[PDB]
Amino acid sequence: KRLAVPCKLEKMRILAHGELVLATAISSFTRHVFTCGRRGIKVWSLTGQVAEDRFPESHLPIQTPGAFLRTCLLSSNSRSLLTGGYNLASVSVWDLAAPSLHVKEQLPCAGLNCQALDANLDANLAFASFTSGVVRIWDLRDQSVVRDLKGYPDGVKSIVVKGYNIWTGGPDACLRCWDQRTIMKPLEYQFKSQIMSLSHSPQEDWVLLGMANGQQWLQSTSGSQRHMVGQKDSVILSVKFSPFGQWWASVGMDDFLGVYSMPAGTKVFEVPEMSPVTCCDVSSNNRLVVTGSGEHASVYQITY
Amino acid sequence: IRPWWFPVQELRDPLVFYLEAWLADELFGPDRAIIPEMEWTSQALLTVDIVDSGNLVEITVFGRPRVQNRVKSMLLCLAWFHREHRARAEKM
């Protein structure tokens, strides 16, 4: 029903990371918020009425000389957290279920720098892409590594996975869709502006794009239909689709965060920030959305 | 030892209910190893001990009262299933 589309977003919560934040994640149970910085991960708790907090519940640093963190990802079940960065010899998995925060197994990525994180929980697989233009798949169960998807140095800035298909996009203004079950070349779709973000609809098979010129497009998996609904006055580098499949939110260099409704691409009232917004995520509970901009993060409440 | 994901505040005012010792060994096992997994999945803190001459076990549940009730009800339903199965087996 149309009632699923929200109406109002409000927030009274502020997190002071202390340095510019590059990724965010939120637990489905709506209990904790995770922010990734340039040198360490910090874990925070929502169970409080504090307006702004400067102290995390824990600080998880990396100690390799010349290390550099870039991204973090949380799986759906709110169990395992993945991390990766620059000048690191391995990727890490962190477990939340144990009474104290302890690290888990690691897999190597020496000689490469990664900016991509996606995980197929039920199949126990993880996905990452590297600046060289390669995508590799890791197994979270038996720690085996088998994958080689490369060929294009560009076009691998964003990753979205749906079953046995992986969608990629980058600065070449081109969109590609891969098949995990085949050793053949992918299928190309050509656009006229740089792609900066991707998000997939969980209910119907549609993929949402964000373009560098402020335009928004919908691509259908049937390979023929294409739509164009939305316009912003600057670059967009963040799109996120709600788990119910009815609405999405978009952020970009315009520093404006707004809510859109499928399929007319109509605007729901928006909330303005003060600086470019580069991080956005929505909980599997379909009640909270968290953002990352500058040295701060925020937690928003969704009203239906 | 309080788990890191459990807030210290929720420790206050726990819920306490009693059960039978054999029921406790059927539910949680003789080694009580399954307690942490149920604690996580239920999001509450549990204590199991035998307090009445080896006959009656006391269980304490920490957390928000609704979670306490949910855990208590699940445990009571499992104990009732065990009671029914044991009565049916003994009558057989």
Place this chain on the structure above:
Amino acid sequence: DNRCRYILKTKFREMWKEVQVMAERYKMLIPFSNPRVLPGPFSYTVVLYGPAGLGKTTLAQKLMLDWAEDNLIHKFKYAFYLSCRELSRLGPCSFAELVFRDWPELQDDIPHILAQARKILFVIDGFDELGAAPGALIEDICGDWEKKKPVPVLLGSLLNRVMLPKAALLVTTRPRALRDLRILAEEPIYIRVEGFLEEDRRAYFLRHFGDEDQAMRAFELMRSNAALFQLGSAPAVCWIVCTTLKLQMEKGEDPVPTCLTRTGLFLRFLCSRFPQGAQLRGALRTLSLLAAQGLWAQTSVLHREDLERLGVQESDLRLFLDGDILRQDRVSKGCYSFIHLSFQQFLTALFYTLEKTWDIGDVQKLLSGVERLRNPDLIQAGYYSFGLANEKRAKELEATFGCRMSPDIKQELLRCDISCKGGHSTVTDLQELLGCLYESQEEELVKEVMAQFKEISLHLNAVDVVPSSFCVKHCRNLQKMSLQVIKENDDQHMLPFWTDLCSIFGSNKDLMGLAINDSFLSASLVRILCEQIASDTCHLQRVVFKNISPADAHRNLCLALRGHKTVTYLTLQGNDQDDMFPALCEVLRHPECNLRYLGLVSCSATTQQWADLSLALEVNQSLTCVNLSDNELLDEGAKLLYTTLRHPKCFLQRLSLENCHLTEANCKDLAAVLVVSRELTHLCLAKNPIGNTGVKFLCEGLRYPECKLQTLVLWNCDITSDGCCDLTKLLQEKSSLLCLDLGLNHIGVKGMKFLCEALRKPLCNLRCLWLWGCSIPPFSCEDLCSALSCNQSLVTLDLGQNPLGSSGVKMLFETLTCSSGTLRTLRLKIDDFNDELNKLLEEIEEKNPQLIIDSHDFMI
């Protein structure tokens, strides 16, 4: 009493309409005899200065005759004529006997004549021909006429007005004596003589020929050559041209080749004027020797005593006299003068051209510049000597006069060459060399002289077109050229001249650069130039157009660049731009154009022109560097340029926006570009007020790891401590930028603190850092020394205008001795140094040898 005036006027009538006309004109000119000038009862010193010829002596004679006839005012009771030529040979005497020597009875009238000082008028001719030394004229003054002294002493005393203060004087002399007279004389009035006007010359030709058509033909022949036409101001040149042209017409010879160059005309006149005979070679040699001796002493009058002492023949003197080559004056009895100094210079060059105690120098002495400064007459002698190098004239002269010529004198010309390839030469030196080579009318000499030029620069007027076009046609080693045709204040005739000039592009094979500055052209020249530019024989690589007029010429020149297969660099400038943009956009949009660098300077524009330029740039796929300086860009044009930059098909690597009138909003859009773009590496922003908010926005752009910028330039950008903190915060992380320029920025203390605390960490990868006009204080210099001790990665450091003098310099040098940093080049300014600083420099050298202790615009 009146018998003297009677005899004077009788002799004048013998030695005497056009003369009357010009005498009346100059009488209007000269204040002394002007009818509307008050004849005040006081001494008048009148000095006449002019080039050779022009008949100032004739004007003086007519004035004296007018005095005799009482035609003039004749306020003076009695007048005398004093000829310096006679006084030259005279020995020491008294002034009274010096002046009375001409009249047999004036000795009786000594008291009345000498006492009546106000009644006497004097006329002096040929003062420069006197030959007296300046010291003799100046020294040993006297106040009494009875004193017995040498002649120059008396002449200087009379000139200096020490005796007879109530007399008036009029003197005619060459301009060289003008300086001596103005030093010696007092109360002077200076009058210049010009000569015959155009109508006077036409009337002279009409009177000589006696027919309208023939006289007009002869006159228009003379107008062909400008140098000859100017030289015609003297009556003697008019007489020579009339006689030569009349004889050529009667015989049937073509007058135009003679009228082409003045050397041929003078040579023809000399050949025709001398009668036939035998052994003319000795007479010609004697005449040439006399001319050279007179020219060296800067004289043109000969005396009988010197002629006898040298051993001249009476027959040779008579032969010279009958042909009017040299003339004898009855009043200046026993004196001979040359027809014109131009003829004397021709004969002197002839003398040196001839195969070989006197004061005659050598050829190199005449060609030497110092002697050119000593004797102004030698430059024209240089022109005539270059002209006499022509083979045909030499053969003709040897045929007629029987003389012989030596080749070594011709080699002397190449030995000096009037060397001009050096950069110390001026424009006038090149003009003189071109004029002399054109006067030569020989191709071999021009080829051999012009082979030295590796670069050329021509400034051309209407008179300069023919010689420059004749010369430049032969050069084939040049590599860079510049042109400038000045607008003047017949086209079919000019057609071959500009055709010859533009041929240099195809003939030469290394003319990589062409420049056209402030040139106003015509339709035919523009057409020929564009045909040559668009041709497939061109090989230009860099072209600069500036201030080319009219607009149609600029547009036509631009249109030839469409599809050019060699031009990789281009710069454009103009005063009016209403039609530049359509042609520029046509060039840019062309699918074959491959210009790699583009530069627009001071071009005015509007929004629509920027829009079509941006569209053409989007279509363009060739250039990697764009320079815009002083262009009146606005915010809208900047936004359109950015929209061109964010397109995913551009490849602009370097970009400059200087004095483009930008603002902080354009800087936020630029931050968006830096986040989006994937090829921009070097960016320059100078003379832009974008310091604080602009630096913050650039920081927003730069924090993203994807950023690829390696060099940023900030000059007069009002950088403050806030920007220093932001830049330090950027530098501490692993950023991509390697260079950072700061100029006219008050970073002296807080900025220095931030930069030094950044520099201390081992993670820094920055290479170069420039500081200028930052006002670094010593207490900041302490932290600077600490940072220099700590760091191990910086490579270059430049300082200037910063007061580190007393303590800062010493502490820095001591730390440099102590430290062994990796920086190679260091530059600094010292208010004052001492011995301890010198030994500190030695210690700096010995402690670290790789340092060299005493570019960004070069890289972009």
